[PDB]
Amino acid sequence: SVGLIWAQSTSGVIGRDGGIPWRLPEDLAHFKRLTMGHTVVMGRRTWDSLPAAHRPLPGRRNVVVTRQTGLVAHGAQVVGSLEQALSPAEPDAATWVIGGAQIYALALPLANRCEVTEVDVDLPPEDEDALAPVLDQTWAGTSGEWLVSRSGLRYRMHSYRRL
Ligand SMILES: NC(=O)c1ccc[n+]([C@@H]2O[C@H](COP(=O)([O-])OP(=O)(O)OC[C@H]3O[C@@H](n4cnc5c(N)ncnc54)[C@H](OP(=O)(O)O)[C@@H]3O)[C@@H](O)[C@H]2O)c1
Ligand SMILES: Nc1nc(N)c(OCCCOc2ccccc2CCC(=O)O)c(C2CCCCC2)n1
Numbered sequence: 001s002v003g004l005i006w007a008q009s010t011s012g013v014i015g016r017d018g019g020i021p022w023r024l025p026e027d028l029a030h031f032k033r034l035t036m037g038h039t040v041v042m043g044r045r046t047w048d049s050l051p052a053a054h055r056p057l058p059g060r061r062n063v064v065v066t067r068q069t070g071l072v073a074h075g076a077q078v079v080g081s082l083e084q085a086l087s088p089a090e091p092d093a094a095t096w097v098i099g100g101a102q103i104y105a106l107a108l109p110l111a112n113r114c115e116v117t118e119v120d121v122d123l124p125p126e127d128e129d130a131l132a133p134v135l136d137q138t139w140a141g142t143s144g145e146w147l148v149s150r151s152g153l154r155y156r157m158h159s160y161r162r163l
């Protein structure tokens with residue numbers, strides 16, 4: 001089955017300036033816990049956004065979606081479409097689409113689960129910000145309690161499944 005996983009500010013921002021515009025260690029831990037041992041599918045800009053020690057994401061099968069036919073991505077599998085990414089030669093019990101905004105929009109109709117971290121950080125969207133998908137009435141969810149990060153931000157985790 002196919003899930004999306006993302007972290008967003010309350011305003012809906014997921015990315016800015018080729019990175020993530022807040023620091024939330026508990027979300028990094030949540031992301032690793034859900035994805036370790038499994039397949040992670042990402043757009044090429046997200047692959048390029050990964051910090052050095054996380055490119056590729058260790059312990060996960062990294063799959064990068066690009067239109068660049070000749071692209072080499074050391075440590076990842078390069079495919080030419082989201083459908084290809086979700087049609088592996090070797091099946092995985094759990095495939096996670098891990099961003100970014102362009103790929104989330106393509107994957108949402110193919111997914112049955114979304115794992116969302118909401119971050120209470122004031123970020124009025126800027127024009128080039130990458131934004132989260134919005135889940136419509138075909139999705140229903142459950143919300144964890146609001147927690148405080150050791151680094152100061154309030155955050156909570158939501159779990160949605162297709163109705
Ligand atoms: N949870 C989070 O907070 C989270 C998670 C992930 C990323 N981010 C952030 O999000 C931003 C990146 O997101 P983004 O939306 O700009 O980019 P993205 O979705 O990661 O990557 C876009 C790229 O995917 C490829 N692509 C898109 N549609 C395609 C299609 N139909 N077929 C083949 N390839 C296709 C293209 O690669 P080519 O140009 O190579 O052809 C395109 O440039 C960064 O700021 C990153 O830090 C945040
Ligand atoms: N909930 C949720 N969903 C996502 N798709 C997601 O982006 C995952 C793609 C970006 O990876 C980053 C970014 C920067 C630093 C480290 C990593 C990976 C760490 C690892 O796993 O080796 C995230 C990240 C948000 C920023 C902090 C790390 C996790 N969080």
Ligand code: NA
Nearest residue numbers: 057058059060
């Ligand atoms: Na690895």
